[PDB]
Structure 1
Amino acid sequence: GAMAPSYRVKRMDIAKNDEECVVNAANPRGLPGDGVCKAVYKKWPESFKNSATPVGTAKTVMCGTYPVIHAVGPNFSNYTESEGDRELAAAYREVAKEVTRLGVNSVAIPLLSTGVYSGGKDRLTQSLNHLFTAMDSTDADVVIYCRDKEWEKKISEAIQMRT
């Protein structure tokens, strides 16, 4: 475990992370995709061997000894708000199980279903609160990665609120 488990947020490419493992915002078919998924494919392409997994699940594949946890959030274009909310919570619970199983002291994590799977809605708070619900019982240092300046401020505020 980390000596004093923390949450932090950084605004940069998750492919440049300083953590012991990464969570990919994956598609169910293990395809290169767009956004975070494409960045992850360029940095760790070996981790896409047999990475396909259903919505609401996570599947870990090693790139050398570096673990890539492929977490499949729902595409809100296809799911109802209710069913998508259930699958988004479930994907993060599976990430917490994998982080624990791996024995890592730190993890880099993007906000699932906030980009091209958002169905055109702002899901920062929804996605971040499901992240916290899953990760709060883990003792890894969590570093959340985002690209938008206003999102960085809002994520930082939400972390600092609960300290």
Structure 2
Amino acid sequence: APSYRVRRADISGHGEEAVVNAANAKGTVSDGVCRAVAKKWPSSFKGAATPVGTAKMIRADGMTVIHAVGPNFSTVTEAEGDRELAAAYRAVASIISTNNIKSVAVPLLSTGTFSGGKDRVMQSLNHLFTALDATDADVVIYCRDKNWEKKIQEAIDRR
């Protein structure tokens, strides 16, 4: 069974075996988690382009980087976005289990740039749990907001 905990820290300082980038489909560096990942592991972006709802892994800069493309909720219906968000997290879980990754730092996909202006912390976290429950990985969820940290911790605890 996987273990879940939450850190309020820059994900670029994670202590896990792998990190999930909240990526865009073009594999470009822009504001958000992606900027922190590009600064710390700059060569991890080579050929990282992957369609919405998929994930693409690379070993670069002594790190395993998993580029997961959550939906942009400005560009899909709510139901379409919810399916694509579930798919991105399942693509992450498959890469974790198939590559024998023992621990992973995970941001909440589609809760920032891609949130379409809405609070999607619980939507994103519920898809994260459902997908990563298929793995044996130690999962560390990263956020920057003290309120999010407690929400996430509350949600971890309720389980």
Who is 1:16 aligned against? 13
Determine the C-alpha separation between the residues in 1 that align with 2:3 and 2:79: 30
Deviations 1:55-109 (A, max 9, x none): 0000001114421000000000111101011100000000000011221210000
**1:131 and 2:101 matched:** no
Cα offset for 1:5? 3.3
Correspondence for 2:92 among 89, 95, 114: 95
Determine the C-alpha separation between the residues in 1 that align with 2:157 and 2:70: 26
Structure-2 change in CA distance of 1:64 and 1:38 (3 Å): closer
**1:79 and 2:76 matched:** yes
Determine the C-alpha separation between the residues in 1 that align with 2:90 and 2:62: 23
Correspondence for 1:7 among 4, 14, 28: 4
TM-score (norm 1): 0.95
User: Which amino acid is 1:66 matched to?
Assistant: M
C-alpha root-mean-square deviation of aligned residues, in Å?
A: 0.9
User: Gaps (5+ residues) in structure 1?
Assistant: none
Who is 2:154 aligned against? 157
**1:30 and 2:35 matched:** no
User: Which amino acid is 1:130 matched to?
Assistant: H
Determine the C-alpha separation between the residues in 1 that align with 2:73 and 2:94: 24
Runs of 4+ residues over 2 Å off in structure 1: none
Are 2:2 and 2:133, in contact at CA under 8 Å, matched by a contact in 1? no
Count of equivalent residues: 159
Are 2:42 and 2:61, in contact at CA under 8 Å, matched by a contact in 1? no
User: Which amino acid is 2:72 matched to?
Assistant: N
User: Which amino acid is 1:20 matched to?
Assistant: E
Alignment of 1:45-60 (within 5 A): 45-60=42-57
User: Which amino acid is 1:17 matched to?
Assistant: H
Are 2:22 and 2:68, in contact at CA under 8 Å, matched by a contact in 1? yes
User: Gaps (5+ residues) in structure 2?
Assistant: none
Determine the C-alpha separation between the residues in 2 that align with 1:97 and 1:29: 21
TM-score (norm 2): 0.98
